[PDB]
Amino acid sequence: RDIADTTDAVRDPQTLEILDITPCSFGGVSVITPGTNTSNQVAVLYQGVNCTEVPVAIHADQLTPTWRVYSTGSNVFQTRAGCLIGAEYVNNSYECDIPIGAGICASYQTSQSIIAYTMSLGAENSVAYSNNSIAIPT
């Protein structure tokens, strides 16, 4: 048992090898959509799961979601909040539009598709500091 007093380790009655019990994978499903006034394609985030555990169940009558063709969708991308299915990772950074988590913010860019990227905090600037130079507005 553990702190929460849950059965998480058992010994098999045949042989003396020990077994570990971890529960079945569960998590919420979050959609990443633009407006329906805009295009109707969405991206789906499975919260807090390893992403090798979702594409085993591309079958019929096997999960709480019923769709099957979307699991064979666009490129998956393991973030720190599960993997995002239906949106592609893009290297350069922009401002946040639809927040996802751990810096990932998806948006609708250019044909057009839902892309995911790391947040850009702002424009990088270097103040011209000197020990004898001042700047005064005119």
Binding site: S30, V31, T33, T36, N37, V42, V44, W67, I98, P99
Partner: protein, 50 residues
């Protein structure tokens, strides 16, 4: 010929009570997002579903 099974739908009524539109709640994630938001128009953002 088609087969009926227990399914949950969202039906849009007009001012005269006719079924002008409907959306399934289990077809694709956009439809169940519309079904759990109780609206045929979904604004831009993130939404938690089943």
């Amino acid at each position: 010929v088609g087969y009926l099974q227990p399914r949950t739908f969202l039906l849009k009524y007009n001012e005269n009570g006719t079924i002008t539109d409907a959306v399934d709640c289990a077809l694709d994630p956009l439809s169940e997002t519309k079904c759990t938001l109780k609206s045929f128009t979904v604004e831009k953002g993130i939404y938690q579903t089943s």
